[PDB]
Amino acid sequence: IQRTPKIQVYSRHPAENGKSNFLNCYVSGFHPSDIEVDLLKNGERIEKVEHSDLSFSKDWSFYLLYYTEFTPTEKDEYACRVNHVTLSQPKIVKWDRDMGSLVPRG
Amino acid sequence: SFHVIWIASFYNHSWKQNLVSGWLSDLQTHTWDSNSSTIVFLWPWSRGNFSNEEWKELETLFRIRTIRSFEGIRRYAHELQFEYPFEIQVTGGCELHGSFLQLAYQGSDFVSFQNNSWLPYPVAGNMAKHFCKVLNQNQHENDITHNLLSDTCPRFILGLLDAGKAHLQRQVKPEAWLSHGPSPGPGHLQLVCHVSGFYPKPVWVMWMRGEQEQQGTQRGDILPSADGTWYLRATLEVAAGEAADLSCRVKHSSLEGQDIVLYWEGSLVPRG
Numbered sequence: 001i002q003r004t005p006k007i008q009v010y011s012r013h014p015a016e017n018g019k020s021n022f023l024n025c026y027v028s029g030f031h032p033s034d035i036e037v038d039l040l041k042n043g044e045r046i047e048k049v050e051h052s053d054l055s056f057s058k059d060w061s062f063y064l065l066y067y068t069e070f071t072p073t074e075k076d077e078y079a080c081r082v083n084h085v086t087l088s089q090p091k092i093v094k095w096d097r098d099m100g101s102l103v104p105r106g
Numbered sequence: 107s108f109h110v111i112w113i114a115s116f117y118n119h120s121w122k123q124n125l126v127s128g129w130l131s132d133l134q135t136h137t138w139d140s141n142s143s144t145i146v147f148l149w150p151w152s153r154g155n156f157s158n159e160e161w162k163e164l165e166t167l168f169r170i171r172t173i174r175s176f177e178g179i180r181r182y183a184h185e186l187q188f189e190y191p192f193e194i195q196v197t198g199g200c201e202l203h204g205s206f207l208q209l210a211y212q213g214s215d216f217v218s219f220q221n222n223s224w225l226p227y228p229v230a231g232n233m234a235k236h237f238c239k240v241l242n243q244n245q246h247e248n249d250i251t252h253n254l255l256s257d258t259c260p261r262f263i264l265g266l267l268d269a270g271k272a273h274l275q276r277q278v279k280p281e282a283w284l285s286h287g288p289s290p291g292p293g294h295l296q297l298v299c300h301v302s303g304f305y306p307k308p309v310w311v312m313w314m315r316g317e318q319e320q321q322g323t324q325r326g327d328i329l330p331s332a333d334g335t336w337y338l339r340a341t342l343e344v345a346a347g348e349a350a351d352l353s354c355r356v357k358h359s360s361l362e363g364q365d366i367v368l369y370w371e372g373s374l375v376p377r378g
C-alpha cells in the first residue's frame with residue numbers, strides 16, 4: 001500500500017567554486033504524500049528552500065522537486081535528507097560533485 | 107492535451123488537505139488556492155481566453171463540488187470501508203483534435219468516468235461499485251461532468267496551446283559537463299555526463315569512442331528544474347586502463363545539428 005521515495009540530487013550548472021548555482025532534490029515514486037525533505041549544507045539544514053507543487057505520476061505515486069540557489073566553495077558538502085513513513089531512518093543522498101585533481105603536481 | 111489533478115488527503119474525520127493543479131501538456135499552468143477558493147493562473151496565458159466572469163462560474167462550480175465531495179466521502183466513508191487516514195487522487199482532462207477522468211484510492215485505480223457514468227475498476231472490488239452508486243446518484247451532475255470533459259476541456263485548449271505555444275515551442279540549448287561517478291568495482295571507473303537546461307524534453311546523449319556509440323551508456327531519468335528545463339545523467343562504466351579517447355556527445359533539437367562534444371580529458375584523466 002506504501003511506496004518508498006526515490007531521491008535524486010543534481011545541480012543546474014556544473015559546479016564552479018564561487019559561482020552561484022541551483023541545487024535540486026527530486027523526490028518521486030512515493031506514497032502516501034506526507035514527506036519531509038531538507039537540503040543540507042555541511043550537515044546543517046538550509047533555510048527557505050523552494051519546492052514545486054505536489055503532483056503525481058500515471059501510477060499515482062507522488063513527486064516533488066526541492067531546490068535552492070547556492071554558491072559552493074571547496075570545503076562545502078551538500079545533500080538531501082528525506083523522511084517518509086516507509087523509512088526507518090531518514091535517508092541522506094549526497095550531491096556528487098567532482099573536486100578536480102587531488103594530488104598536486106604544481 | 108490538458109488535465110487537472112486533485113490530491114485529497116483525509117487524515118481523520120476532522121482534518122483534510124486538498125491540492126489542485128492544472129497542466130497543459132506536462133507544464134503546470136494553474137493552481138487552486140484552498141483559502142479564498144481561487145483559481146491561480148501561473149502564466150498570463152493561463153487564463154486562455156475565457157472571461158473573468160466565466161472563471162468565476164468555474165470557480166464556483168469547483169468550489170461547490172469540492173465542498174460536497176469532502177462531505178460526501180466523510181458521510182459514506184464507513185459504508186465504503188474507507189479507513190482514516192486515506193488519500194483520494196483524481197485526474198481528468200482531454201486532448202484537442204481523448205476525454206478521461208480517473209480516480210484512485212490509496213494510490214490504486216478505484217473508479218473512472220466513462221461516457222456518462224462512473225464505472226468501477228473490476229479489481230477495486232465491491233467498495234468501488236458502492237462508490238459508483240453514490241457518484242451516479244444524480245445523472246444531471248454526471249452530464250455536467252461529461253460536458254466538462256468533452257466540451258469545456260477541448261475549448262479550453264483552444265486559447266491555451268495557441269496563446270502559449272510561444273512557450274511550449276521554445277528551444278533552449280543544453281549545457282553539459284563531465285564528472286566521476288561512484289566507482290562500480292575494483293579497477294573500474296564510472297564516467298558521468300550531465301546534460302542540463304534543455305527544452306523541449308526529447309534529447310540524445312551517448313558516451314562515444316570516436317564515432318562508435320558505447321552501448322554501456324546508462325541513461326538516467328530525465329529530471330525537472332524549476333525553470334522548466336530538464337536534466338539527465340548518462341553514465342559509463344569502464345576499466346581504468348580503457349578510459350582513453352572517450353567523449354560524451356549530446357544531440358538536441360535546439361542545437362541544429364551542432365552536437366555538444368565533451369572529452370574525458372585534462373584533470374579528469376588525469377594528464378601529466
Ligand SMILES: CCCCCCCC/C=C\CCCCCCCC(=O)O[C@H](COC(=O)CCCCCCCCCCCCCCCCC)COP(=O)(O)OC[C@@H](O)CO
Nearest residue numbers: 112114126127128137138171172174175178179198247259
Ligand atoms: C487548479 C484549478 C484548475 C482549473 C481548470 C481550468 C480548466 C478547466 C477545463 C477543463 C476541466 C476538465 C476536467 C474536469 C474534471 C471534473 C471532475 C468532477 O467534477 O468530478 C467530481 C470529482 O470532484 C472533483 O474533482 C471536483 C471538486 C471536488 C474535489 C474534492 C477533492 C479532490 C477529489 C477527492 C474527492 C473524490 C471525488 C468524488 C467525491 C464524491 C463524494 C460523494 C465528482 O462529480 P460530482 O458531480 O461533484 O459528484 C457529487 C459529489 O460532489 C458529492 O456527491
Ligand SMILES: *[C@@H]1O[C@H](CO)[C@@H](O)[C@H](O)[C@H]1NC(C)=O
Nearest residue numbers: 154155156157158160264265
Ligand atoms: C475568445 O477570443 C475571441 C477572439 O478570437 C473573442 O471574440 C471572444 O470574446 C473570446 N472569448 C469569449 C468567451 O468571449
